[PDB]
Amino acid sequence: YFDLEDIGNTTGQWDLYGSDAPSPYSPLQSKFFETFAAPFTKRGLLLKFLILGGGSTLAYFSTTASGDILPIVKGPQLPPKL
Amino acid sequence: SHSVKIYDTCIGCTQCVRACPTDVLEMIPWGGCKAKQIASAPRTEDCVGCKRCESACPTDFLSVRVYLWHETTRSMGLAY
Amino acid sequence: TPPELDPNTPSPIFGGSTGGLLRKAQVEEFYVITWESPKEQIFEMPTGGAAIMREGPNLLKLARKEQCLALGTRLRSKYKIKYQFYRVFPSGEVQYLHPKDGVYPEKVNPGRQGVGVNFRSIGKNVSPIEVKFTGKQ
Amino acid sequence: SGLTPCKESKQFAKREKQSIKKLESSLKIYAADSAPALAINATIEKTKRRFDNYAKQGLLCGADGLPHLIVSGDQRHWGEFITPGILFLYIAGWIGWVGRSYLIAIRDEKKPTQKEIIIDVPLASRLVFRGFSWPIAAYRELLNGELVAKDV
Amino acid sequence: LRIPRFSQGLAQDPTTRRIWFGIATAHDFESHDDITEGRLYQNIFASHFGQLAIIFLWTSGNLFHVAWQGNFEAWVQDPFHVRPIAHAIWDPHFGQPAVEAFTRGGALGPVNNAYSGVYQWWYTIGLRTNEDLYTGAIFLLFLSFISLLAGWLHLQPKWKPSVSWFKNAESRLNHHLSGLFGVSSLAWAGHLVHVAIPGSRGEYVRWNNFLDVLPYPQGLGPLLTGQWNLYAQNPSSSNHLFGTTQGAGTAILTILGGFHPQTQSLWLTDMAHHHLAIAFLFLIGGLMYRTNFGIGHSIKYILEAHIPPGGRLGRGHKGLYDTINNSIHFQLGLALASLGVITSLVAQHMYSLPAYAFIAQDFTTQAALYTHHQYIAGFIMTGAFAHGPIFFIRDYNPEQNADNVLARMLEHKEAIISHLSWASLFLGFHTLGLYVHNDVMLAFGTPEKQILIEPIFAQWIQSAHGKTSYGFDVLLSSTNSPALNAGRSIWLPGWLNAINENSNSLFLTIGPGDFLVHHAIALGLHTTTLILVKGALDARGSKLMPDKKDFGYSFPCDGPGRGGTCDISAWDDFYLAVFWMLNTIGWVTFYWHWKHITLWQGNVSQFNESSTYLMGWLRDYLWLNSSQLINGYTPLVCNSLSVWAWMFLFGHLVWATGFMFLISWRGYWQELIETLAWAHERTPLANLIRWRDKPVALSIVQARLVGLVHFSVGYIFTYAAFLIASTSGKF
Amino acid sequence: PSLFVPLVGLLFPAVAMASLFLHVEK
Amino acid sequence: HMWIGGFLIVGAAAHAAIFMVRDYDPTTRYNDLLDRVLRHRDAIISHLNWVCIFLGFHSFGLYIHNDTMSAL
Amino acid sequence: PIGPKRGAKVKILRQESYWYKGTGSVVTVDQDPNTRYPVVVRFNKVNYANVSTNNYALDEVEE
Ligand code: CLA
Ligand code: CLA
Ligand code: CLA
Ligand code: CLA
Ligand code: CLA
Ligand code: CLA
Ligand SMILES: CC1=C(/C=C/C(C)=C/C=C/C(C)=C\C=C\C=C(C)\C=C\C=C(C)\C=C\C2=C(C)CCCC2(C)C)C(C)(C)CCC1
Ligand SMILES: CC1=C(C/C=C(\C)CCC[C@H](C)CCC[C@H](C)CCCC(C)C)C(=O)c2ccccc2C1=O
Ligand code: SF4
Ligand code: SF4
């Protein structure tokens, strides 16, 4: 009934489902976020920061009192033939 | 895409064409057999490689041979 | 032969399905098929079930090409109906395939060109050979 | 042959006694004169008999107390393999020769496969006994026991 | 454009198929784009240096951890009552009872008990300290580097060799025999007489004193003079303590035979003598073929001249030289075949003739090593039989091989295959027949009706070796013969002592149970060979598919036409044989392990009676030794065998997962994914994200592989978990 | 010491898997 | 009874599928119930596909959890 | 009129034929020189495709 070689888009599911909403905005509080979230918006630079943020994992394990790394002590079993 | 070939050992029974669901083959005027026809493979781009054509061939061993080569969406038979 | 071309035609009655086009159509390709019915009949429709055929030009859009032929080969049987389908593309364009020659591929026609015909006969193929090609040229 | 014959065996002899005591344990709950009674006692005599026979015929019996067969070809123990083996090949050939003789007779004329699924031809004219003398197929070998179509 | 760059046809695949196949074809150089014979040869040659680099790095790490986290020194001082340490354990997931149970071998933390036998090997050759182990690790790390340096060097144009250089076979044999085999064996005999033997006796001969310490009291003279018996006058005393200068002779070359009584290992003096002996044959042998000096042979001509007149081999081996040298698949299949054979020869001779000190008493290590190499030998054999077909399809020139021994195999292929079928059918019908029969009577409670064929032929071989068991009166155990007296003391008295040892594995006692299993293994060999050669001889084509030659080694199939053509490629025939190979080695390793764990417990009586019927195997071997294993972790406690209990279940899971890829096939999965592709598209908050590769079901051949990989991994890991734990638990 | 390295043996998969992903989609 | 009951249910799947191949004719015997079902068939399977993955994880996974926590 | 009789038995020489070294009866033999493969042949045994006949080239032996 409605196929138009002119517009190939409506013909296909090209249309954004009504879930799209191109409406206004949100409060001015954004002016704050835009200021402090800027260094993480660069990409690639952020890729690196997070990977080198893996330096946290090293720091957290080099220093860790309560993970089972001690026997605590025992007298070991010989044991099948010593 | 897939590579299909026809051989002069054909007898022009046209069953390979009727078997194809994508329309990869067709009949051709020729002087080699009594039917004076021969299979042709012009549209290999639409070939999916299912070998339905081979299972209709009556020649002692196939006159039409499908050689599965590079894969494409059409050959992969994808609808998405 | 001159391709007839398709402009606008009504679609057959159906009501919807989940086997229709999806994204591929938008960005790669989609195939449409046209056939004329002497009666508002009922046909199976692949990728779904039950659709009324309609009477008139009848235009349907599908994907994979094969879906169109399946319908077309069922359309030629059961009902004595002629049909034709094309590949739409995403930016207009007019590629018309099948019948093409205007006479069915199974029926021998006068000027087609062989394309990939080997006059050697099978079993007489060679063995490689590190050079380009496989020997079934 | 570290084995010492089933006669001077203490294990194989012990094994006999062990088996019959267990059988005897079972008849105690049925009361003689009853059915399950003989069946148990009939089983016991067969047990004694087979143990008795094995010691007679030789049979070496290992340390485990069970007879071990010797197939080296040793004349002392031919009955353990060669003589039954000769008997097998005889019947094995006989079957082979009769079966071959059948498919050959069928091939000329008729619908050959008809005779294969249905054989309302029994031993054909009289094909079975032909196997009584199969070994004479050695003489079929010097002529045409094999077809010359493929290789030699 | 994309990965794989070496395959443009693969790189343009819109689906997920490209990533998979890009990985599975990376080493198949001949199929790469614009491949040349030049590019082919020095890709392999460079890949060769890469493999060496890995081996040396891998061996460097072994020397490193044992020196860093392994006691070794504690092990040296009491090789009998201490457990070797592979490396330390560090796992955050470990609970306190775990860290507890795994703290062993006098280590400050949880470690793994090494079952590779590296301790016995390193100790026997003369490594006594951790410092020694480090220097080896550094040296191997350095050896690992110069391998990469050479790999990089010959990829450079000013150092790259010509293909012809690679095809000069006459000179590569002359060097590999004379140098690679001969000299390296000779050099090892030097380490033995300078370090291993004196290190064994008690002196520490190292780099800072090896120059000033005579390997023998008498000078190097006696060798050069001609009188070499002086190297065997004073051998080590029978009651000698290893690493102790007690009852230690002076001789550096002997033929004593038998075992060093304390260590239960072969004499070092015998080995220093062995390698020296074999070095020569290799050294002289590496001077057979012609190079640049005007003397030597031509391999081609020898192959040409070997034509038996009046048939029946035809042209003999003419043109066969060029068929092999121009085809590196033939060479590899020929290499794997030889390597695969001696790989088992290693396994068979290393449990019968322990080479290292205190390895014979480490029962878990002995079982592991044998089982290790038999599976390694197994897979290698399937590869030799795999590159075979590939040779036929890709490199075989029928005309250039007209009517020679190779071409005569294809023209009577139906004969070889059918008789392999017969031999397989024969063995299977009776071996299984004899087994089932035996189970019947034991069920019926009459084990005296069994068919227990005494392996009298093999027992005749044992008596022929020196075993005085049985009444056979054969060579080396008879009343009058040239054979035993040819002993002339030397090897015989020390060796005949070793054969009649009721403790060692040197020629165990065999019976009816050993008869049935040997036929089972014979069944396993024949059937596996039947599958593999049939794939090879029909690789170029059969009657169901005469042009299989035109499709390559690996293709999915040829369709459902002509009755159906599933698994018709030579690749699939390999893939089917891998199953049979695993079964065969499975029977071999079952048989080896059970007979030994019954011997080690001093109860061979249980094996001799339970091995004659199949219920015995499943119960007294499988069921019986699983108890300690499956209680590695209990709803009450947690043992050191918890790793193996978990891996045991792990192996089961991988194994059963392969079954999915082997039974269920593609068309079901592809249609399933197509519904999932529709879903993702029609789901809000997920529409924003799209895939860059089209989701598709795995290929027909890919699934057979993926399924076989799962099947094989679980196969190994399950038995590995059982072989170690069941043996380690009891010791 | 040995409690610093098995995690970089797990930082490495994160790095390797990320890099390879970029390589294969390019 | 569990096996007999199990087998018969599987047999229902067969003949239901046989009906679709051999006896389903919309021209003569339309139902409409059958339609739609065929119409949103890619939906039903896709959802049922998900439930199995959810169930499989939240069933077998718990055991693999317990097997791992007890071993450690 | 060409090489093979109408009732003569003939051995196949194709190598790719199901009946590669077998024998078969000939139906007839077309005489058009244009025809690459005449010499139709009947066989007692069918191939993997249930066909009993096939046309062959002039090169074959008789018997
Ligand atoms: C000297 C040893 C050697 C060498 C140099 C080669 C070399 C070659 N082989 Mg060969 N092969 C060998 C031994 C060898 N093989 C042996 C011993 C066997 C018996 C199994 C085979 C069986 C074999 C087959 C069936 C094929 C080859 C093929 C090839 C060619 C391409 C391989 C490729 O890149 O695909 C890529 C390889 C991979 C991507 C390997 C990854 C998959 C495996 C399963 C990984 C290991 C298992 C798993 C990951 C373990 C993880 C468990 C975990 C839980 C711990 C190449 C010439 C192929 C060929 O010739 O092309 C026609 C071919 O199809 N080989
Ligand atoms: C889910 C539970 C779980 C997890 C996450 C782990 C994790 C680990 N275990 Mg524990 N373990 C467990 C359960 C678990 N285990 C249980 C139930 C037991 C029995 C009680 C044990 C007993 C145990 C022992 C005895 C040991 C460990 C060790 C280890 C560590 C391995 C060291 C390493 O990473 O090197 C590198 C990682 C590998 C080599 C894995 C590679 C295998 C992959 C799959 C194949 C190769 C991939 C291929 C190259 C593809 C490339 C892709 C890639 C580049 C992205 C690791 C932290 C070891 C350790 O502490 O380290 C010092 C150790 O010795 N475990
Ligand atoms: C003296 C001269 C010499 C020497 C020493 C070598 C040595 C070598 N060559 Mg070279 N080559 C030479 C001359 C020489 N070649 C000449 C003149 C040419 C042609 C003009 C070539 C052309 C050539 C090519 C094309 C290649 C080589 C390769 C190799 C390496 C083989 C792979 C390997 O390491 O395993 C060595 C094996 C051993 C040392 C032992 C032999 C195997 C036995 C059966 C093992 C059992 C021993 C013992 C019982 C077990 C002990 C185990 C215990 C220690 C744990 C090896 C380093 C290959 C390579 O690049 O390396 C990866 C290869 O691609 N060579
Ligand atoms: C083809 C089948 C076959 C195969 C592959 C094997 C393979 C093997 N056998 Mg078995 N063997 C067989 C049949 C076979 N045997 C038969 C039918 C018997 C008599 C029951 C034996 C009795 C036997 C004994 C006592 C021993 C072996 C042993 C062995 C191993 C060492 C090699 C050897 O001596 O055997 C030699 C095989 C032959 C000499 C026969 C070759 C195959 C012939 C052609 C089968 C047909 C012969 C026919 C039945 C003779 C008629 C008998 C009579 C009427 C004349 C090896 C695994 C030894 C072993 O290691 O034990 C663990 C061992 O001591 N075999
Ligand atoms: C034991 C082997 C095995 C396993 C694990 C599965 C698993 C599955 N099958 Mg399969 N199947 C098998 C054998 C197996 N099958 C065999 C032998 C056959 C022949 C009949 C089939 C036939 C079959 C059919 C016809 C279908 C399935 C389907 C499914 C899936 C159902 C959905 C699900 O539960 O997801 C959850 C996954 C699991 C429960 C597996 C374990 C998950 C682990 C414990 C958690 C992840 C571990 C960890 C995070 C990994 C990270 C480690 C890192 C180093 C990689 C599931 C993947 C169906 C399907 O496609 O989905 C609906 C389906 O249609 N199977
Ligand atoms: C449904 C439950 C189930 C399933 C599916 C399995 C499956 C498996 N088990 Mg397991 N097992 C189970 C329960 C189960 N088991 C239970 C409850 C226990 C109690 C402990 C065990 C104890 C166990 C052990 C100790 C072992 C397995 C192994 C295996 C794997 C062997 C793979 C194979 O096919 O090789 C081939 C099959 C065989 C070799 C058959 C062996 C069994 C026969 C009776 C032994 C006789 C061999 C004989 C010499 C050959 C006969 C000759 C012939 C001519 C007649 C397979 C994964 C083994 C493994 O890791 O794989 C090698 C392993 O060793 N299981
Ligand atoms: C003596 C003896 C022995 C040995 C044996 C042997 C070792 C032998 C052999 C053998 C051989 C090595 C043989 C061979 C051969 C061959 C051939 C070549 C064949 C053939 C055949 C045929 C042809 C048949 C036919 C037929 C008949 C006649 C019957 C029926 C069937 C048919 C019909 C199938 C032992 C000691 C073991 C035991 C004791 C005794
Ligand atoms: C489950 C299944 C699928 C579906 C399998 C798929 C879609 C594979 C995808 C696996 C996902 C991506 C997880 C696998 C993770 C692996 C551990 C991969 C690790 C990464 C590298 C080591 C390669 C098939 O396509 C198939 C085809 C033919 C016969 C049987 C089957 C079959 O059984
Ligand atoms: S394989 Fe399929 S698509 Fe290709 S020619 Fe044959 S029938 Fe047509
Ligand atoms: S099936 Fe064979 S003979 Fe028939 S038209 Fe096709 S190619 Fe020609």
Ligand 4 centroid to residue E500 C-alpha, Å: 27
Helix%, strand%, coil% for chain G, nearest 5? 80, 0, 20
Class of domain D1-152: mainly alpha
Nearest CA in chain C to A8: C90
What three-state secondary structure class fits C60?
Answer: strand
Going along chain C, which residue ranges are E strands?
31-35, 37-43, 51-56, 59-62, 83-87, 95-97, 117-118
What three-state secondary structure class fits C62?
Answer: strand
| Radius of gyration of chain A from its Cα atoms, rounded to whole angstroms | 30
Ligand 3 centroid to residue E115 C-alpha, Å: 28
Probe ligand 8: pick from E660, E669, E694, max atoms within 8 Å of CB?
E669
Ligand nearest to the CA of D83: 4
Task: Say how far apart CA D34 and CA E43 lie, in whole Å.
Answer: 87
For residue C97, list its beta bridge partners. C85
Contact present, E56 and E140 (Cβ < 8 Å) = yes
Measuring CA to CA, which residue among E598, E444, A64 is closest to residue F4?
Answer: A64
Which residue's CA is the closest to the ligand 8 atom numbered 16? E706
HSE at residue B54, side-chain half, CA atoms within 13 A, is 21
Chain C residues with beta carbon closer than 8 angstroms to that of G39: 15-18, 48-49
Q: How was this structure determined?
A: X-ray
C51 dihedral zone (left: phi>0; alpha: psi -120 to 50; beta): beta
Amino acid at position E597, single letter: I
Measuring CA to CA, which residue among E458, E413, E460, E453 is closest to residue E437?
Answer: E453
Probe ligand 6: pick from E435, E585, E622, max atoms within 8 Å of CB?
E622
Task: Say how far apart CA E455 and CA E447 lie, in whole Å.
Answer: 19
What three-state secondary structure class fits E382?
Answer: helix
The rounded Cα H34 to chain-centroid distance in angstroms is 17
For residue B26, list its beta bridge partners. B40
Dihedral sign for Cα E588, E593, E594, E596, please. positive
Per-residue three-class SS string for chain A: CCCCCCCHHHHCCCCCCCCCCCCCCCCCCHHHHHHHCHHHCCCCHHHHHHHHHHHHHHHHHHCCCCCCCCCCCCCCCCCCCC
- In the block, which residue shows the tokens 């008493």? E361
Task: Say how far apart CA E599 and CA E594 lie, in whole Å.
Answer: 8
Which residue's CA is the closest to the ligand 10 atom numbered 1? B57
CATH fold of the domain at B1-80: Alpha-Beta Plaits (3.30.70)
For residue E297, list its beta bridge partners. E289
Pairing assessment for the beta strands C117-118 and B3-7 based on DSSP bridges: parallel
Which residue's CA is the closest to the ligand 9 atom numbered 3? B47
Contact present, E712 and E704 (Cβ < 8 Å) = no
Cis peptide preceding E585, ω within 30 of 0: no
Dihedral sign for Cα E388, E393, E397, E403, please. positive
CATH number for the H1-63 domain, one of 3.40.50.720, 1.20.140.10, 2.30.30.50, 2.60.40.10?
2.30.30.50
Does ligand 4 lie within 6 Å of residue D69's CB atom? no
Contact present, E558 and E545 (Cβ < 8 Å) = yes
* Cross-chain Cβ contact C19/G41 below 8 Å: yes
Nearest CA in chain E to H48: E562
Ligand 9 centroid to residue B45 C-alpha, Å: 10
Measuring CA to CA, which residue among D90, D126, D91, D134 is closest to residue D105?
Answer: D126
Structural tokens at position E491: 């090897």
- In the block, which residue shows the tokens 């190097």? E220
Domain range annotation of chain H: 1-63
Measuring CA to CA, which residue among E211, E15, E651 is closest to residue B74?
Answer: E15
Q: H or E segment at E57?
A: helix E37-68
Domains contained in chain E, CATH given = 1-731 (1.20.1130.10)
Distances (CA, A) of C69 to C32, C85, G39: 10, 8, 21
Closest CB to E633: pick one of G43, G49, G71: G71
End-to-end C-alpha distance for chain D, whole angstroms: 44
Pairing assessment for the beta strands C51-56 and C37-43 based on DSSP bridges: antiparallel
HSE at residue H7, side-chain half, CA atoms within 13 A, is 0
Dihedral sign for Cα E370, E373, E375, E378, please. negative
HSE at residue E426, side-chain half, CA atoms within 13 A, is 9
List the CATH number of the domain containing C46: 3.30.1470.10
Task: Say how far apart CA E703 and CA E567 lie, in whole Å.
Answer: 12
Task: Say how far apart CA E441 and CA E330 lie, in whole Å.
Answer: 51
What three-state secondary structure class fits C134?
Answer: coil
Interface test with F, best of E87, E90, E108 (most F CBs within 10 A): E90
Question: If contacts are CB pairs under 8 Å, which of residues 517-576 in chain E contact chain H?
Answer: 543-544, 546-547, 561-563
Domain range annotation of chain B: 1-80
Contact present, C134 and B67 (Cβ < 8 Å) = yes
Chain A residues with beta carbon closer than 8 angstroms to that of E81: 81-82
Give the CA dihedral E718, E724, E725, E728, nearest 10 degrees. Answer: 170
Residue B47 assigned ligand-binding role: yes
* Cross-chain Cβ contact H34/B31 below 8 Å: yes
DSSP code per residue over E400-435: TTTTSTTTTTSTTHHHHHHHHHHHHHHHHHHHHHHH
Measuring CA to CA, which residue among E22, E13, E5 is closest to residue E694?
Answer: E13
Dihedral sign for Cα D108, D110, D113, D119, please. negative
Amino acid at position E722, single letter: F
Task: Say how far apart CA E413 and CA E693 lie, in whole Å.
Answer: 45
Distances (CA, A) of E144 to E57, E86, E136, E179, F5: 6, 21, 12, 21, 22
Domain total of chain C: 1
Q: Which domain does C27 fall in, by range? A: 1-137
| Radius of gyration of chain E from its Cα atoms, rounded to whole angstroms | 29
What three-state secondary structure class fits E141?
Answer: helix
Contact present, E314 and E408 (Cβ < 8 Å) = yes
Q: Going by C-beta distance under 8 Å and a sequence separation of 6 or more, which residues neighbour residue H2?
A: H29, H31, H58
Structural tokens at position E346: 């290693």
Task: Say how far apart CA E614 and CA D16 lie, in whole Å.
Answer: 23
Amino acid at position E304, single letter: E
- Other beta carbons within 10 Å of A13: 16
The C-alpha of E89 sits at a distance from chain F's nearest C-alpha, in angstroms, of 9
- Other beta carbons within 10 Å of E191: 16
Contact present, C113 and B40 (Cβ < 8 Å) = yes
Dihedral sign for Cα E652, E655, E658, E662, please. negative
Measuring CA to CA, which residue among A20, E339, B30, E262 is closest to residue B63?
Answer: B30
What three-state secondary structure class fits C107?
Answer: coil
Residue B33 assigned ligand-binding role: no
According to DSSP, residue C96 is labeled E
The C-alpha of B80 sits at a distance from chain C's nearest C-alpha, in angstroms, of 5
Q: Going by C-beta distance under 8 Å and a sequence separation of 6 or more, which residues neighbour residue B58?
A: B11, B13, B15, H49, H51
Task: Say how far apart CA E144 and CA E131 lie, in whole Å.
Answer: 20
